[PDB]
Design a protein around this ligand. Structure first.
Ligand SMILES: CCCCCCCCCCCCCCCCCC(=O)OC[C@H](COP(=O)([O-])OCC(O)COP(=O)([O-])OC[C@@H](COC(=O)CCCCCCCCCCCCCCCCC)OC(=O)CCCCCCCCCCCCCCCCC)OC(=O)CCCCCCCCCCCCCCCCC
Ligand SMILES: CCCCCCCCCCCCCCCCCC(=O)OC[C@H](COP(=O)([O-])OCC(O)COP(=O)([O-])OC[C@@H](COC(=O)CCCCCCCCCCCCCCCCC)OC(=O)CCCCCCCCCCCCCCCCC)OC(=O)CCCCCCCCCCCCCCCCC
Lengths: 67, 59, 31, 365, 41, 49, 54, 37, 54
């Protein structure tokens, strides 16, 4: 509405960092892992999938690249 | 019908032993899939019970 | 007698010949 | 002929949700006495398409169980009723099981069919041995892209008027309005011409269905309500690696949330290795997807389906004893101890096998 | 009513199979049964 | 289960990552492996071993 | 990041998944061995009919 | 080839497609003839 | 047992469902009111054709 943008900014904070603007530095999820949830292994599988799509499933590129 | 020939007997006994070799292999694959029906969820068996299914790994 | 009495005999020879790979085997199949 | 036997009937519009009868195909098993399996096809999808999967010698599923390929209400040949409440649609199956003299059955489903199968176990668990769901989850799918297309296509199908529209006008309408090849083929084959070629119509109730989907509320088929409760029995889930309906990231949690006995990934939940393809939903078409589903299906029916919760597999029947809770039996002079739970015959109610074997036991003594 | 209550309660298979043989196409009893049922229908 | 218990996962893969370094051709791993264990308690003080 | 410990989890999760499909992967390995075995048994079926053909 | 590409842009058929079996036009004719005959 | 507090949960858990199905429950009440309204509008469709019938 009229006073929506001015008011919403007044009530809450946004994240100012642009950490994700850089592409290659984007995390695949291996930094903060959930260890006890019942979908533990399904989370690891999506991490493995993301690591493979980034390298066309040639993970030797990831080993040589910077983490 | 009684007696066929000499050369025929040579392959009558060759192809029989030949088939017995590959029937023994056909039985091996068959009996494995038969025993495999009792094996389920390899990840839910104890360590020493799994080694008993694959008898010989302990040796 | 004349008709159909040789149909089965043709399948046996066809399979026997198809299995032949070496020229020597092909020759004996023709014989 | 014999193996394939589908009862024949005409759909009847019903004002009362209890006077609803279900119709479908029955596939007889190889052996004389086998438990029964009830399988629900995708919504608006033909039961015949699943026949080659359950009638393939390579899979040999009928060697394990007799299969009832059943259509839910407002689908196929079954009766018609505007309500799609899973509690009502579950009671329909219970009456079918009664009319056919089935004490308890194995339930299966594909996509939305999987929801229907699980609802019966949620409302009638004492009479369901297990559930095998294929590319489905007990989850709200109203906002899934795959559901929107189906929800969108059904709305487009309401524009056609068979009375005025000609056969060619229909074919042109489907190709342009329906982009998905499979959905298009499914809908074409769902069109039927009534006796005396009075006019053509869809086998499924297009009006009642669109209202359920278009309204897009709790009663929607994409939605899974908390009212449905929890399933207490055996449940196995199999879905493609890249599936538009069930995403491996978070759509697996509802299984643990709704099914109490689900152990987790690798035991009761599996994904089929595959590529990204919108047609992977229809596993029966691709041999690679089907071969894995069949093996996993045969494994669930052989070792896990109809097995007591605290037992690992069917192998433990008769050799694993379950602990007993104190003061759980009426007999006061009872020494509480471990016991092997009772597993009954699949149709013990409508037969006299127990009465017969009791006599044979006396002859021994 | 009594009689009404009482009433209420191979070769074609070979023909189709031979056809499928000539085309050397895989055939199953379910397919043959449906085709046989398709012929009667 | 060696594939779900992280305690044996960590030790099995860690032990395999060390015995494989025999390909560096230092000397008989059967000899100096005992010194590695003792040397760890010298520098492992940094990690509270 | 020091992802050494993570690499050990990811490898275990992939092995855990292979064990879950041990039955499917081995049965596919035998489907080829049975195809080869059945192919060699085609010769004995041919010789059995030689007496009937003769 | 040019005119063909430009122009580019039955119960027996459906039953066979269900079994994902490749069917030739000749086979379809015989089955239809077999039913009518 | 003293199940007083439980009785308060079961009712709240039941009302939670009635609220989730508010749209369907109300929509069905109108399906009957709309039926009554459509029935009264049939008298106007008959009169509009009298001039043509005459
Ligand atoms: C050749 C060995 C050299 C060892 C040097 C000595 C020790 C390290 C000193 C430098 C400190 C930084 C360390 C970075 C590397 C981390 C290595 C590591 O920790 O292992 C992870 C690794 C597996 O974990 P990973 O996550 O996959 O590794 C990827 C990285 O995490 C992340 O992946 P990545 O691909 O993104 O990164 C690749 C890697 C590539 O690294 C290289 O290629 C090495 C380059 C050549 C060597 C340069 C260092 C040489 C130092 C010698 C001079 C020392 C002077 C000291 C005083 C005098 C000394 C006499 O790192 C770099 O890229 C370095 C770039 C630096 C960017 C600088 C940007 C500006 C920053 C300015 C501020 C700096 C403040 C820093 C704060 C202080 C630092 C603690 O473990 C192994 O490799 C196992 C095998 C052993 C490797 C050989 C030994 C190397 C030392 C590791 C410790 C070994 C412990 C053995 C026991 C194990 C437990 C029982
Ligand atoms: C008219 C008022 C009467 C007043 C009587 C005076 C108080 C007697 C105290 C006796 C101790 C037990 C009390 C049990 C009643 C508990 C009711 C209750 O607490 O409310 C729950 C109740 C709802 O909760 P509920 O779970 O649905 O109620 C059902 C019960 O849970 C369970 O449902 P149920 O169907 O299973 O049971 C129905 C209920 C029906 O109750 C009645 O209709 C009252 C009938 C008159 C009294 C009969 C019992 C008198 C006690 C006999 C003691 C025998 C001792 C023998 C000793 C032998 C060894 C030397 O209980 C009975 O049937 C009593 C039968 C007793 C059989 C005894 C069997 C043999 C045991 C021998 C072992 C001896 C151990 C003794 C150790 C000490 C005691 C632990 O709340 C209300 O309904 C509010 C209205 C309150 C009604 C008026 C006030 C009555 C007093 C209640 C407490 C004050 C409430 C307001 C609190 C405000 C806080 C914000």
């Amino acid at each position: 509405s009229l006073h929506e943008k001015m008011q919403t900014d007044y009530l809450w904070v946004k994240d100012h960092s642009q950490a994700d603007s850089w592409a290659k530095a984007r995390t695949h999820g291996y930094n903060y892992i959930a260890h006890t949830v019942p979908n533990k292994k399904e989370r690891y599988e999506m991490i493995w999938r993301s690591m493979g799509k980034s390298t066309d499933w040639e993970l030797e590129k990831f080993r040589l690249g910077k983490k | 019908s009684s007696a066929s020939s000499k050369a025929l007997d040579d392959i009558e006994n060759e192809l029989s032993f030949h088939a017995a070799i590959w029937l023994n292999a056909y039985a091996d694959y068959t009996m494995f899939l038969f025993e495999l029906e009792e094996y389920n969820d390899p990840n839910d068996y104890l360590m020493h019970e799994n080694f008993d299914f694959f008898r010989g790994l302990e040796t | 007698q004349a008709p159909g009495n040789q149909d089965k005999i043709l399948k046996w020879i066809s399979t026997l010949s198809n299995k032949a790979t070496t020229g020597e085997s092909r020759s004996y199949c023709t014989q | 002929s014999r193996i394939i036997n589908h009862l024949r009937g005409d759909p009847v519009y019903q004002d009362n949700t209890k006077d609803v009868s279900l119709r479908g195909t029955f596939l007889r098993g190889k052996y004389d006495d086998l438990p029964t399996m009830i399988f629900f096809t995708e919504a608006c999808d033909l039961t015949a398409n699943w026949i080659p999967f359950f009638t393939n010698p390579q899979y040999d599923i009928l060697a394990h169980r007799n299969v009832w390929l059943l259509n839910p209400r407002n689908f196929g040949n079954s009766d018609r009723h505007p309500s799609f409440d899973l509690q009502e649609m579950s009671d329909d199956v219970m009456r079918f099981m009664y009319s056919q003299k089935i004490s308890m059955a194995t339930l299966g489903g594909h996509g939305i069919g999987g929801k229907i199968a699980l609802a019966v176990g949620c409302y009638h668990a004492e009479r369901v041995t297990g559930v095998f769901s294929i590319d489905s989850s007990p989850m709200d799918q109203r906002y899934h892209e795959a559901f929107k297309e189906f929800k969108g296509y059904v709305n487009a199908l309401t524009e056609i008027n068979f009375k005025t529209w000609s056969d060619k006008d229909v074919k042109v309408f489907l190709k342009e309005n329906i982009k998905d090849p499979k959905w298009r083929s499914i809908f074409t084959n769902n069109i039927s011409k009534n006796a005396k070629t009075q006019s053509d119509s869809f086998n499924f109730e297009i009006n009642y269905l669109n209202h359920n989907l278009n309204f897009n509320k709790a009663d929607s088929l994409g939605n899974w309500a908390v009212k449905n409760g929890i399933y207490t029995g055996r449940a196995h889930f199999i879905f493609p690696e890249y599936s538009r309906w069930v995403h491996l990231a978070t759509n697996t949690l509802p299984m643990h949330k709704v099914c109490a006995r689900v152990k987790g990934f690798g035991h009761d939940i599996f994904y089929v290795q595959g590529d990204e393809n919108p047609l992977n939903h229809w596993v029966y078409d691709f041999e690679n997807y089907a071969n894995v589903v069949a093996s996993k299906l045969n494994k669930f029916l052989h070792s896990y389906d109809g097995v007591h919760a605290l037992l690992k597999d069917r192998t433990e029947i008769g050799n694993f004893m379950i602990p007993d809770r104190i003061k759980s039996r009426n007999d006061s002079k009872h020494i509480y101890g471990d016991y092997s739970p009772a597993h009954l015959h699949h149709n013990w109610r409508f037969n006299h096998i127990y009465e017969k074997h009791d006599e044979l036991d006396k002859k021994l003594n | 009513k009594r009689l009404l209550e009482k009433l209420n309660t191979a070769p074609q298979n070979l023909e189709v199979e031979n056809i499928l043989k000539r085309y050397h196409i895989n055939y199953t009893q379910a397919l043959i049964d449906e085709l046989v049922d398709w012929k009667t229908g | 289960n060696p594939n779900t218990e992280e305690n044996t996962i960590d030790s099995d893969y860690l032990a395999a990552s060390g015995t494989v370094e025999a390909e560096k051709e230092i000397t008989s791993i059967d000899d100096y492996l005992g010194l590695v264990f003792a040397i760890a308690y010298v520098f492992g003080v940094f990690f509270y071993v | 990041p020091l992802l050494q410990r993570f690499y050990r989890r990811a490898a275990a999760n992939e092995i855990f998944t292979m064990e879950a499909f041990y039955h499917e992967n081995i049965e596919n390995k035998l489907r080829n061995l049975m195809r080869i075995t059945k192919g060699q048994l085609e010769y004995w079926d041919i010789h059995t009919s030689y007496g009937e053909i003769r």
